[PDB]
Amino acid sequence: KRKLIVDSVKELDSKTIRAQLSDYSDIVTTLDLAPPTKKLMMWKETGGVEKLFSLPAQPLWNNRLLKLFTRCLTPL
Amino acid sequence: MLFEVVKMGKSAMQSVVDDWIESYKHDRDIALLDLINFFIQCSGCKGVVTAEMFRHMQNSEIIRKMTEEFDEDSGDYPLTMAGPQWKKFKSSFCEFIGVLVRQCQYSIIYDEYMMDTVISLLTGLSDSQVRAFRHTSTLAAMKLMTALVNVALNLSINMDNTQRQYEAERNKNERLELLLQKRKELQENQDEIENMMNAIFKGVFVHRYRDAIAEIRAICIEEIGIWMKMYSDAFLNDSYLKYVGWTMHDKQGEVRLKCLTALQGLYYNKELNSKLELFTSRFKDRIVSMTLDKEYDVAVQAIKLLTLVLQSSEEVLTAEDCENVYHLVYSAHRPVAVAAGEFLYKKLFSGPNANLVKTLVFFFLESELHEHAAYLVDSMWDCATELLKDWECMNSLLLEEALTDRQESALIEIMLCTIRQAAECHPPVGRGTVLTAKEKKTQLDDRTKITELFAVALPQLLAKYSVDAEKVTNLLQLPQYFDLEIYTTGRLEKHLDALLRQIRNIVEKHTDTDVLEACSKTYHALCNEEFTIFNRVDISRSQLIDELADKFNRLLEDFLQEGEEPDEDDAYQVLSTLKRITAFHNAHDLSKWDLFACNYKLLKTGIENGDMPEQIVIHALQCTHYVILWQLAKISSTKEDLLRLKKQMRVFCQICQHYLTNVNTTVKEQAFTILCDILMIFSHQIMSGRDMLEPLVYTPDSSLQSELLSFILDHVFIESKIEALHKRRNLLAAFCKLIVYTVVEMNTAADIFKQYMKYYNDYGDIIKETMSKTRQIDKIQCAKTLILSLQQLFNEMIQEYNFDRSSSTFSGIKELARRFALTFKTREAIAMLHKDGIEFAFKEPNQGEPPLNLAFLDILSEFSSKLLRQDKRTVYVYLEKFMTFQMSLRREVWLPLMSYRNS
C-alpha cells in the first residue's frame, strides 16, 4: 500500500466552474466590526479569561488600591 | 547529477546551463537524457530513465515505469516540503528552466529535437494521476512558457527593427534580398514559437488551471498573470483574461489571491488599457464583493486593486461601491482597514488643512457603524499622519470662529483619538500585534507639541464646552497624555491653576458618572509626586474635597432627621453630592476625612427603613469599600487604626450580605462584586508577603458561602445584548476567583462545572479555566467535585425515579461526561472518581429487584476508558463490594452495569 499520492480525479468539471461563477456566497462574509462604542472597547481590552482572573470585579483606579487585590492573586 | 547541482550547491545558474548546452552540442542524446532525468528527480522520484528506455519507450511507458520505480517513503515531494533549503530549491528549479530557454533562443531552440522532447515529457507528466509528477511538471511547463514568451517578445522586437531596416533601403540593392531573407527567417521563427506556446497552453494550461489540487491552480493563474504583464500586446486580451475572471470565483483563498495579484500587476506601476477596463467593468461587481472575502488576506488585495482601478479612472466605481469600501475602515482586522483607509483618502481627500479636517468629521458623522473615532483614526494613521497630528489646526476650529455642536463633539472625539494614538504608540485594542528609535523620537516630539499646545488650550476648551457631558468627558482625558515637567520648565503654572479651576467648577455642576470619573482620574494624573507640580495640585485637591465632605455632612443632617421624610428631590441632592465623593475616593486617598461614619450611617439607615433609593445605596456601598481599602493601604503603622479597620471591615461584610437579598436587582449585583472583592483582599493570602496582617484575615460563614452561590445561580445561570453578557461573566469570574484561590469550599464548583455544556459560548472559557486552576491546585478534590457535578445533573433529571435511557437529558449528561475524561497523583484521581461514582450508584436501594441510582454507571462508563490496566482490577474489586452474584448474572434494565463492567 503505497504512500505515493495518486489522484483519481485530476480536473474540475466544466459544469462546476459554471456553478462557481453563479454563486460565491460561501466564500464571502459580513463585515466584522471593531468595538463600536467606548464601553465595548474597554471590555475588549479588559476581557478574556486571563484578564478577568487577574482583576477586581469592582474596578480600582489607583494602583495603590489595585496591588491590594493583585497581591493575593499569583500565589497559588 | 543535475538535480544535485541545482539545490545542493549554489554555483551560478548560468554556469550550469552553459555546461548543459556544451554537452548538448557534444552529444544531443546523452544530454537530453540528463534533462529528462532532471525533471523526474525534481518530483522526488528515485527512479532513473536509461538510454535504452529513452531510445525505445514512449513517454507514457516511461512515466508508468517511473511510477513503479519511484521508491517513496512518505507522500512528500520537493515542492511541498517546508524550510528555507527547499524554498531555495523551488526557485533554483524555476530559474534553471528560464535561464535554459533564454540561453537557447537563437539556435538550439529551433532545432526540431530539444524543445519537442522537453515539451512532450512535461505534457505527459502533467497528465499523470501521480501528484508529484503532475504538480512538478506543471510548474516546469508554466515556467517554460514564461521563458518562451520572452523569446517571442525579443523576436517581435527584432522583427520590428529588421522591418525598419528593410523600409529604409526600399526608400534608397542586394542588401534588400538579405533583409527580405532575414525577415522571412524570423517569421518562420515566430511560427515555431507560437506552436510551442500553443502546445504548452492547450496541452497543459487549459487542463491544469482547473486541477483538483488548489496549489496547482494557483501556479497556473500566477504565470498567466505574468504573461499578460510581460507581453501585454499579445496576451492582454479577453482570450487570456477570462481564465483569471473565472478563477476569481474559485473556492480556495490561495487561488483567489493570485487572481488579484495578477490583476494588480496590470495597473501597477504602469498602464493605460481599454481591453483591461472592459474586463474590469465586467467583473467589478465580483471584485468589490471580494472586499469581504472570507480570507482576510484576499480581502486586502481586492481593496488594493480597487484603489489601483481608481487611479486609471473613477468611471467604474459607483456610489454604493465606494460606500461599501468606506465601511471596512471599521473592520476588526487592521490590514483591511488600512487598505480601505488608503482608498478613502485618495477618494475624498484632495489654515490649509482645515478643510480636510472638516471632511473627516463629516465622514465620521455620516457613517453610522461607530460612535467613537478610535478605529476610524487608526485606519488613517498610516496615510494621513500629517493631517492627524495637526492639533493647532483642530484646536482652532473649536475656539476662534460655522460648526454645529454635533460637529464640535465629533471633532472633539477625533481630536482625542489622534492624541492618544500619538502619545501611546500602539493601535487601539484588537488592532495591535515595537518600538524603534525614530518612533520614540516622534513620540517625544508628539507629547511636547501636545503638552505645550494643550496646557494653554485645554482650560479655554473646558470653559467653552463645560456644560456638555460627552465633550468634557473627552477633553478631561487630555492631561493623562502630557509630559508634566513642561508645566514648571515651560513656566505654565498660571494655566495649570486655570485648569484646576475649570475641573473644580465642572465637578460641582455635574452629576453624570462618566464626567466625575474623568475628573477624578485626571486629578490623579496631575497629583504625581515625581513632579514639582504636585504641591500646587495637592492643595487644589484638598480644597475641593473639603467642600465636598462639608456639604455632605449638612445634607446628611436634614436627610436623616426623623421629622422630615425626604422626597425624590431631597434625595438627588444627596446622590449628586455622594457620587462626587465616591468618584474621588476611588482614585484618591481621602483618609483625612473619616467618612466611614457618613456612609455607614447611610447604609444602616437604608436597612432599617427599607426605603433608600438604589443609586444612593450603590454609591454608599462603593464609597465605604474605598474607605476600607484606603485604610488597608496605610499599614507607621498604628494598632488602634488596625483594630478599628477590622471592625469596619467585619461590619461592612454584614451590610453587603443584607443587601445581597435586597429586592433591587442592580443593588444585589453591586453588593455582590464588592463582597467578592473584599473576600479576596482579606483572604488568607493577605499575609503572603506580610504577617503583620494576620488579625485581618477573614473567612466567610458557610451561610455567606451559599448565598454567593445562590446569587450566581439566580443571576448568571438564567434562561445592548452584549452588555447583559459582559456583566454576567464579570460576576461569574468574581466567584470563581474565590474558588481557584480556595476562599470558598471547592464543593461549590459542582454547581458551576455542570454548566460547562449548557452555557458553552457565554461562559465556556471561564468555566474551563476554573477547572484547570483546580486541577493544578488539587487533582484529587477536583475529580471529586467533577463527579458530584454529574451527580447533581442526575438527581435533577429524577424530578422530570426512572427512566428514559434514550432521553435527551440523559444523553446530554453522558456527553458532558465524555468531556470531563479528556481533562484527566495522575491516576489516584481517576481512582477516586470511580470509587465515588460506584458509591453513588448504589446509594439508595430498590422494593423488588435494581438500586435506584443504577443508571449512573453508563455515565461512569465514560471514565473507565482513561485509566487503567492495573487499576481496573482494583476498581472492580471495589465494585464487587457493592455488586452481588445474583446481580452479575441478571442480563435483563440492568444494562448499565453489564456495560460498565467492560473495563
Side-chain angles (χ1 to χ4, degrees), chain B residues 4 16 35 127 168 420 551 561 630 634 663 735 780 885:
Chain B
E4 168 214 347
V16 49
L35 192 59
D127 192 46
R420 173 173 58 211
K551 172 163 167 185
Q561 289 172 356
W630 273 112
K634 67 173 141 88
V663 185
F735 187 77
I780 288 167
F885 192 80

Side-chain angles (χ1 to χ4, degrees), chain A residues 1-15 17 19-50 52-65 68-76, chain B residues 67-68 70 72-75 127-131 134 207-208 210-213 246 249-251 256 286 289 292-294 296 327-328 330-332 369-372 375 413 428-429 474 517 521 524 583 586-587 589 622 626 629-630 670 673 677 680-681 685 722 726 730 734 736-737 741 765-766 770:
Chain A
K1 288 182 153 233
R2 300 282 286 268
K3 311 248 259 168
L4 184 73
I5 310 181
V6 182
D7 293 318
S8 316
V9 169
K10 301 172 297 169
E11 298 179 53
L12 293 168
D13 189 345
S14 292
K15 264 156 154 192
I17 299 234
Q20 289 180 352
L21 303 190
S22 46
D23 177 21
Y24 50 81
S25 50
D26 54 340
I27 62 167
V28 119
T29 171
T30 39
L31 165 57
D32 188 26
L33 291 187
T37 66
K38 290 152 186 293
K39 275 274 156 311
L40 281 164
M41 190 192 162
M42 273 181 91
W43 287 112
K44 184 138 170 182
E45 179 181 342
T46 225
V49 309
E50 295 197 13
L52 271 181
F53 278 87
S54 42
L55 302 171
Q58 188 63 48
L60 297 172
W61 296 346
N62 195 313
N63 276 351
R64 289 187 61 197
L65 293 190
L68 298 174
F69 182 93
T70 308
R71 186 182 44 178
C72 311
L73 280 181
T74 318
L76 251 270
Chain B
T67 309
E68 180 189 351
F70 202 111
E72 77 288 350
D73 291 345
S74 61
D127 192 46
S128 183
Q129 291 177 37
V130 183
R131 196 182 290 160
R134 193 160 85 268
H207 303 302
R208 278 315 108 227
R210 220 175 30 178
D211 198 272
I213 311 309
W246 299 336
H249 299 79
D250 198 84
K251 257 41 194 164
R256 275 192 319 273
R286 175 54 185 143
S289 80
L292 281 165
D293 187 288
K294 265 227 182 67
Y296 284 116
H327 293 166
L328 306 177
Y330 305 107
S331 170
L369 281 179
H370 265 36
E371 281 165 20
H372 62 114
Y375 292 101
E413 166 67 37
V429 69
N474 266 281
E517 172 171 345
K521 264 159 178 287
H524 182 242
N586 198 144
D589 195 339
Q622 262 173 155
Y626 307 133
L629 286 197
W630 273 112
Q670 180 62 92
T673 72
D677 266 19
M680 255 287 257
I681 285 171
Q685 235 68 32
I722 289 191
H726 270 257
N730 186 46
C736 285
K737 284 178 262 130
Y741 293 113
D765 280 348
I766 297 176
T770 303

